[model samples]
Target: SKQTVGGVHVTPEMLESVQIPLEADKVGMTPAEKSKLVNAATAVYIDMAVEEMRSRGLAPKADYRVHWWKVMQDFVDSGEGQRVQETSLTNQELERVIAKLGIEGEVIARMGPEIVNILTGKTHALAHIMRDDLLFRVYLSDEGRRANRYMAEYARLLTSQRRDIRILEIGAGTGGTTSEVLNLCSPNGESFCAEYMYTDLSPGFFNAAKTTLKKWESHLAFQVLNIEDDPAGQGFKEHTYDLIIAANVIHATARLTNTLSNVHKLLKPGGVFGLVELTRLTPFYNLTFGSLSGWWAGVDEGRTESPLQSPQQWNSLLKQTGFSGVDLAAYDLPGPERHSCLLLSTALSNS
Candidate 1:
């Protein structure tokens, strides 16, 4: 019956990971952590929610949290939730929560004290570990590997015996994608990174990337560049990079149309423009919402003030931005569960 009911046993590692504290000097948090935390918490909350459902004689195992959050958000939209995401709890409040969670810094120092306390069994609500275990079980799928394969193949084609490629990426938030790109491309050419322009957006992204790059500077260079709203207006050299990549970031731009135009303007005539984004589709939404697999879809959806373009529309925009020889395909993803895989879209400018 446990299996029938989605009885998740959260783990110690999960709680340890989240409750850990971080230093605040502006580098260590990450883009993915937000989704990670939400997903992690959901596993526990769902367990409880389903238990409540069972008590009421409802189907406890049915996967329908999407409807729940959507309904909840909708209600909150007109009432409380609107206030939470909007006014009462500003970005400042949210960011502080993220920081307190111990994921916003490089060293993860604060978690140590908590772990010590957990070792002594001294804290309340320490069952996050059980929730974390459940999340790992549900979301880790073959799809993510397949998507990575596509990314690798694309990288290989670009750097096939080519060295010293000029590359500039605009949104390298917290470096998970940055790490992947570097691992794939470093053997082929030099790579430069421009991570997280919105400091409050995910300080951990820059922090984590910078922290790692400090030890691996031999492989890549990191910077802070947001071409769409460049504070350093002339910070980028026109047409300098051999390749430019920004994963899942353009959608958040205030002006996506103008943003793509600028990205094209910055690329060399024959240089390639690569963007890895989540394909917005109903199946994709259902897969994520009907099942508590991963945390990204909802969070990515949250970033938009309005519904953005679909993959087809994004490809069209690529052409409008002056990129040609464009190609869009899923990387050799293992499955569709990895948000990166199911939502993966790439464009190229061979000419």
Candidate 2:
């Protein structure tokens, strides 16, 4: 029951990876502190933006920024979507607004800097999945731990003998998933992460992940390589890795078939393939910002379109990619919404 909802795919705007804001506005804020304050701000921002867009007869999705800016950048050069909305206006001009709220630094930065304007005391409640409590609860309640447990469980059930397990992980975002695997899986396991090559794009996130993950003493390695760049670049020997683990990464890969094929070639025969990704509860809203208007309108109506497949569809894709005996665990996790997130596994039978 996955419908293809189309329009724009907006990337979650994050600043966590960036160096702590140099300005002392929230100078001594810790990551947790910053995140909470930022989350508050983002909530307000989403509501305002959604209302504004709805009034304009526009739909805000992951791709709204791209489309909206394309149409009205020159006209609405001062409000939402304008880079200057937060830090751009003159102090005297914004005094009424600021005096009313009395805060420093970017308005967006002060509250739910990610999606809502925290300073304005406005919020979208559960409009954005990433902003909702369930996602954070899963994150904090250690779903990553559960993911690691599943990987270890699968490795134990699927693999044989007392041997060091070698793993190659792609799209190791934030290193959150990798740390979990290393901590839960083989004490003798070695992980080599292939990340995106553009240092500019993820410089902040990469650094934060690198720093946090480095604290644990695990056999882990990392490199900046993208699938598009072909990290192996004609040099990947067949059967080099025992297992390949990628979570929430397949969609971003330039070519899914080629990547899975490479997984088959790289992983030893009978190697395990494990993946985890977001699932959609309502097709109209797939863990992003656009469906927010529906929430504000107090309507339960959804677009009934999502890019991901249901369990059956995913099983089919795994089989088509040369993986047999695919067993998707019936693990319904608490993510951004009431969506049924998955933890799926299969083997490189053709290897």
Candidate 3:
């Protein structure tokens, strides 16, 4: 249990450095306050949906609630809909389909003022903190921290016996996993990695990482690579990298087949792909991320309801995409019990 999640091994030193699952009171709020804030975020999501629908001349059928389920369905199928690679939101038909949706029971109508009261002042900060940058800045939950620590430990282990390991991190949002890997694997004046490529779709994160990770500057490189596209054409050499990591990012790809194939192509045989992502949508995650258009990106791919892939689903997808030896963190836990999971797999030999 010390060095493993599900069945994967994570070093003890890495876990301590990352500090997973601290109590809510360990920060500023108690458990109860945190719970309310979670619901507050949910309410905010509902409010956004209602406002967006009303903006398009859609109205509530009865008094407070409007049609929601089909509205989400409409949102998922539109041009700018559930696929992250598909950015054609400027099309005209999307507005028409949502207009024909059915009632999903509006959320904010009942939780209206109650929702605002929680999010307005000090309470209001909670919602933004939850969605904005709080998770990166603070350790909000144990599972999220566990995921980061597991990835860090895996990187450290990979580099210990090997020299000059070339690593790539995709969708490296705000350097949560990036920082963990460096602090543990690349110390103050040295590193096990030959070069660690930190990439995201946005350059803003690059600027942010440049300042914070400046100490490890020599071992770091930043880029904007869209995994949904072909990496070889993007100037990435095939069968080169020793390790590739993505934290909560792979599910956003428009197609699992295409995205994983690109990932498989970028790695050398036996090179590991390590990641952490939510397998189930809690009311907390559902109400929060569900409001974003990007959240639906998996709908058209392989996901049915949530924009996430279960551990079993991931293993099968990896096999289909030419990966082998898939390892899921917290493998013994039930699907709903597993929050953020560490999913690790190896790129099969090309022979």
Candidate 4:
């Protein structure tokens, strides 16, 4: 029989297919060395948990060191003693344990107080840790490479149809995808002649994006865009954009309906809205890291707390918001790389 954890069913197939990339340097290390590394990396979380529990006057008597070690051991063992990855736990193994413990609440409830605290502290840390080279490797794969190519090609196709391809891209973080798409749009060794408005809720990422995107500066502009609110109120003209791109960002909008409506109003007739979104394809993702890393938390301005929607859900949402010709496609890499879908849609034509 399949097991259930936190109201999500874990079919036997899900367990049989668990896969994560083994770090390059850690492959040949003895179990002892690997164990020690996991302990040291996670030790800070345990320490934070202990200090917080004590300060709150609710410290549990359980020994967190022993508990965390046992958990990691089980995690390592479940994959038949494969080498561990740097940034993620064994999600399938963790889900099995959560099922065994009858844990069905938030990420914090899957383990004891100490372990919970450790994960809690680590949640905020993962945001910055995602920027690190070792951990960032987990999100790169052939599938992601192809997906970025599709994004650029699609933008180029739109440019061919319309000479003045005014583009409004929300949430251009670090400008990784932005650069790729821009390069393709620029047939020559220069910036695309189209106006590209690069925007995010805050200016925190602008400096980095600007520095990396300097070569395309001839036609690029920056702005602060909050999708949940009215774009026109933020100095944006209605029915102006030919292409609007949101890369791994739409899920953060507080309300999908409101945000999509804003997009609908901003796009010119036959304009395209391209969205690249990381999906909750598996329950383990939704129940564990999706919640633990605070990725689902409402950190963005005017954001809401919601699980990353599946491609089907996004399709329905897009259609519901006066869009037509909606298309959905998924891509998955071999390892722990993010599985995502690209959605292409156009505003309904009134003719």
Best by TM-score: 3
| Cα error of candidate 4 at position 47, Å | 19
70 Cα displacement, candidate 3 (Å): 5.3
lDDT of each: 0.42, 0.41, 0.61, 0.55
Q: Per-residue lDDT for 1-351 in model 1, tens only?
A: 121000122222221222212222123444244334323332323333334444555432222233433432343345432232233334354345534433211112222223223222342212433244322222222223334334434544455445655666666655544555566656443542332122213444565566654544555555556656542375556666666666556665656666777776666566566666555432222222323222222344352222345556676767666765235444221233224421222233445
Task: Give the winner by lDDT.
Answer: 3
RMSD of each: 16.2, 14.0, 11.7, 12.3
Question: Candidate 3 overall Cα lDDT vs. reference?
Answer: 0.61
Stretches of model 2 off by over 4 angstroms after superposition: 1-51, 56-145, 155-162, 186-210, 215-218, 228-231, 234-236, 281-306, 333-344, 349-351
Q: Which has the better lDDT: candidate 2, or candidate 3?
A: 3
Query: On residues 1-351, what C-alpha lDDT tens digit does candidate 2 reach at each position?
Result: 221111111111211111222222334444333333333333344444545655667543443233322222222343433431444334353333323221222333322233322112244433333343333233323223444444444444333342555666666656656655554443454332221111111334566566655644344555554543444664444566656666555544444555566656655665556665545432112213222332122121221232344556556667777775345443333333323333444455562
Model 4 CA deviation exceeding 4 Å by range: 1-123, 126-143, 187-191, 282-294, 297-306, 328-338, 349-351
* Model 3 misplacement above 4 A: 1-21, 25-143, 302-304, 331-336
What tens-digit string does per-residue lDDT give for candidate 4 at 154-216? 676567555767899987776766877887787464655468899988878788788777777
Candidate 1 lDDT (Cα, 0 to 1): 0.42
Residue pairs that clash (backbone atoms under 3 angstroms), model 4: 6-104
The ten-residue window of minimal lDDT in model 2 covers: 3-12
